[PDB]
Ligand binder design. Structure first.
Ligand SMILES: [Mg+2]
Ligand SMILES: [Mg+2]
Ligand SMILES: [Mg+2]
Ligand SMILES: [Mg+2]
Length: 87
């Protein structure tokens, strides 16, 4: 319906690695993005930023393993509810 009248601002870091991994939709599971950002940063020892309403950016390509990491950390994310958009 009507899109909310609302302004958001976010700083987004320059990518220093060959890739960045963008994670969207954790908030639709009521996962707190600050908690998620902390987990990813500590888990991977790479930079992680909250960059959108429902969006986290991780420095590095973690697409081969991040689905299993997310599902282990937040097991409410069932197999039918998470996917790599590059595949
Ligand atoms: Mg991959
Ligand atoms: Mg692997
Ligand atoms: Mg899995
Ligand atoms: Mg798809």
């Amino acid at each position: 319906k009507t899109v909310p009248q609302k302004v958001t601002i976010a700083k987004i870091p320059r990518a220093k690695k060959k890739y960045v991994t963008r994670v969207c939709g954790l908030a639709t599971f009521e996962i707190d993005l600050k908690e998620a950002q902390r987990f990813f940063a500590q888990k991977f020892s790479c930079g992680a930023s909250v960059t959108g309403e429902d969006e986290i950016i991780i420095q590095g390509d973690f697409t081969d393993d991040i689905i299993d990491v997310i599902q282990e950390k937040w097991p409410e994310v069932d197999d039918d509810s998470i996917e790599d958009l590059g595949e």
